[PDB]
């Protein structure tokens, strides 16, 4: 049936090996926050194992409400890694967010003379960037182009030694123009809408270069292709040989992530370590 | 309703508007402060004072205020900001003094020659008054936390030879921050000393403790428990120190340092006691034999020095055909993210790097300088450090290692003094130096 034998789940775009003809014709509570969560506790656990996380200073632009924020700021609390959280939207955030020495929340709208602002009050600060700015249903490829201008200009003007941006190309059919964007690596996300097509893009930079790449009409087209093969057929498997309570594709995905992060509770089996975080981040956010 | 009384009872007086929000979310923690025994812990540090700082010229009476007045310096702190902070240091106090600081008061010889043979060929280059007691109460902490702190350094080997003059105590703790935050306290309430809690930058999760004129107290590097099941250990005198053996291959990797090196020609005999007890060690512990056989060691290093990446053929003792060492941190983590890897071992401040065995190559980062004999050559001291480095891999993941040990340390027997032509420099670590000052009520990171 609709059943497949893997060695791994993609974990970046590049990974993906087929594609398929995008077809118009085309589920768990809070499931935005748990796509949130395992991604960016997916990427800071990487920045952590690399040794770029401590002491690091984390701007987060446009994280409201940012409920899942609390637990990975508690969670690499617990692990003693020293960090200090800057919640910067146009909108309010989750009260559960409040009252915490280590993290800042800011409301207001974000633009180059602000961004210049903190950039100079945070210096010599490390910065490790997150960026899910979105401007409604669908944003047009315009709205995306200036989303994108944005994400550079945060970069130029905050220097990080590290990124996450919201990346989601726009559709080949509604192209406008070509466009950069950092180098990185296109991370997949586990419990992303049925059929998005977005990713996001990890960068960690050298020298003071950002390294922009150019997107074309054509990368928009490879683009849509390999994440309708993904949304279609890959996530809608069952992985016959991956023994863990859920066997559909997104938990597998899920657990190549967790097992990447640190616990300090010790752990049997890396299976005993990913259930106890699946667990733990399920009751966080009030998924059953 | 009682959440309200919570954070009036607390600040000693009506929490205004803005207060009442702000600390609403500490409303549990605050609770528990409230609630702690404060003449029992005034007790506590007294008891502890008679024990470790007898020579410390405070009365009781002093003491006991410095103490009361800190925890009720809220009732007389408006900041937000400066209340989270009290709130935060209070809590750790309460939570986890008795626990961590409370709990304290309830062959070598024939090796010499061999040492001094070794370090000579390599010669080629060119602090407060509570440090006492600090180390002291320290020699304490070591056996009655063997599972949370562990002791490299001059110490260590003292404990094995006690010849060795150690300067302080070295180590690693899976909670540093806590351990620190204790102590200077601690240390505030005994001596009234304002002391400075400091994070370094260029160091992995390093914090010291600094006195008032910004004299070196002690220090701390954290470590998560993973690190410390894995790193090598012995235990002796009840502690737990990390097997000379693993101490010996970082004595060889520090070399490598420039810095180091210079530290050598300055102070040789001081290194000479140091690395005959290893030595020693080692001879007795895993039967090396020092009969100046070479063998396949030390490893070709090739240096790109273009982009600072130096090649070691590891061919001839591992099943990875070559290890590609970069000199920029920054550059192997992106390389790492290219190659689509997420499981790099980490051992933190252990190794100060990462390790990455891909496709038969291992990627890994040197810390310290590469020195070099000619343009574009490795100094075989730099080759030593390089291979060393790559052994500590070897011994965090049980690996073979002993032979390759062996050959490297009997490839520094014998040798004519290299001169060196140049050393690369160490790549650039950004970060602010943090710190919390207690007397201020400011935690900055
Ligand atoms: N640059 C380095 N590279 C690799 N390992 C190092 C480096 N610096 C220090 N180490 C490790 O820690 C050990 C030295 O710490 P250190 O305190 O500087 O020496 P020490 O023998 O304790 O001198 P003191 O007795 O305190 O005066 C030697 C080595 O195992
Ligand atoms: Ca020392
Ligand atoms: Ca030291």
């Given at each position: 049936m609709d059943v497949v034998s893997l060695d791994k789940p993609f974990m970046y775009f590049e990974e993906i090996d087929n594609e398929l003809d995008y077809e118009p014709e085309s589920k768990l509570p809070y499931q935005g926050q748990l796509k949130l969560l395992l991604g960016e506790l997916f990427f800071l656990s990487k920045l952590q194992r690399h040794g770029i996380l401590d002491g690091a200073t984390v701007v987060y632009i446009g994280?409201?409400?940012?409920?899942h924020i609390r637990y990975l700021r508690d969670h690499f609390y617990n692990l003693g890694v020293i960090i200090k959280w800057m919640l910067i939207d146009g909108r309010h955030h989750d009260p559960i967010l409040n009252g915490l020495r280590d993290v800042t929340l800011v409301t207001r709208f974000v633009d180059e003379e602000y961004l210049r602002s903190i950039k100079k009050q945070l210096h010599p600060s490390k910065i490790i960037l997150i960026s899910d700015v979105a401007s409604g249903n669908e944003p047009s490829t315009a709205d995306l182009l200036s989303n994108y201008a944005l994400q550079n200009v945060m970069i130029s003007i905050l220097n990080p030694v590290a990124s996450s941006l919201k990346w989601r190309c726009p559709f080949p059919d509604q192209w406008i123009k070509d466009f950069y964007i950092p180098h990185g690596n296109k991370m997949l996300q586990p419990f992303a809408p049925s059929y998005s097509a977005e990713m996001r893009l990890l960068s960690i930079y050298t020298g003071e270069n950002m390294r922009l790449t150019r997107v074309t009409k054509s990368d928009a087209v490879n683009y849509e292709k390999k994440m309708y093969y993904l949304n279609k057929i890959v996530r809608n498997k069952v992985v016959v040989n991956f023994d863990y309570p859920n066997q559909e594709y997104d938990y597998f995905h899920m657990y190549f992530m967790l097992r990447t992060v640190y616990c300090n509770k010790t752990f049997p089996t890396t299976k005993a370590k990913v259930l106890f975080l699946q667990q733990s981040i399920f009751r966080f956010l009030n998924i059953p | 309703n009682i959440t309200l009384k919570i954070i009036e009872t607390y600040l000693g007086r009506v929490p205004s508007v803005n207060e009442y929000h702000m600390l609403k979310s500490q409303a549990r923690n605050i609770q528990k402060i409230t609630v702690f025994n404060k003449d029992i812990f005034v007790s506590l540090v007294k008891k502890n004072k008679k024990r470790f700082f007898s020579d410390v010229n405070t009365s009781a009476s002093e003491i006991k205020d410095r103490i009361l007045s800190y925890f009720s310096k809220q009732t007389q702190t408006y900041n937000i900001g400066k209340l989270f902070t009290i709130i935060e240091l209070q809590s750790v106090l309460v939570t986890t003094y008795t626990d961590i600081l409370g709990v304290l008061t309830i062959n070598v010889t024939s090796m010499e020659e061999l040492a001094r043979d070794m370090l000579n060929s390599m010669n080629v280059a060119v602090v407060s008054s509570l440090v006492k007691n600090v180390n002291k109460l320290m020699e304490e902490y070591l056996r009655r936390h063997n599972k949370s702190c562990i002791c490299y350094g001059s110490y260590s080997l003292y404990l094995i030879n006690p010849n060795i003059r150690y300067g302080d105590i070295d180590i690693l703790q899976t909670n540093s921050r806590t351990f620190l935050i204790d102590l200077a306290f601690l240390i505030k309430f005994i001596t009234g000393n304002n002391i400075i809690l400091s994070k370094i930058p260029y160091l992995r999760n390093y914090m010291v403790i600094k006195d008032e004129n910004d004299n070196h107290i002690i220090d701390s590097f954290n470590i998560r428990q993973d690190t410390m099941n894995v790193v090598p250990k012995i235990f002796i005198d009840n502690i737990y120190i990390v097997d000379p053996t693993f101490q010996l291959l970082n004595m060889i990797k520090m070399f490598s340092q420039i810095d180091r090196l210079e530290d050598l020609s300055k102070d040789p005999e001081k290194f000479n006691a140091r690395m005959a007890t290893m030595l020693e060690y080692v001879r007795y512990?895993?039967?090396?034999?020092?009969?100046?056989?070479?063998?396949?060691?030390?490893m070709k290093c090739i240096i790109d020095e273009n982009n600072r990446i130096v090649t070691v053929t590891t061919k001839d003792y591992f099943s990875f055909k070559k290890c590609l060492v970069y000199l920029d941190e920054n550059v192997l983590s992106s390389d790492i993210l290219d190659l689509n890897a997420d499981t790099s071992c980490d051992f933190e401040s252990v190794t100060n790097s990462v390790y990455l065995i891909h496709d038969n190559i291992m990627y890994t980062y040197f810390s310290n300088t590469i020195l070099l004999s000619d343009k574009g050559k490795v100094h075989e001291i730099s080759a030593r450090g390089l291979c060393a480095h790559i052994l500590l891999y070897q011994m965090l993941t049980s690996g073979e290692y002993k032979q390759c040990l062996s050959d490297l340390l009997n490839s520094m027997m014998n040798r004519d003094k290299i001169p060196i032509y140049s050393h690369t420099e160490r790549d650039k670590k950004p970060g602010r130096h943090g710190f919390i000052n207690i007397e201020k009520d400011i935690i900055v990171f």
């Open positions: 994280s409201a409400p940012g409920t | 512990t895993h039967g090396i034999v020092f009969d100046g056989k070479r063998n396949n060691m030390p």
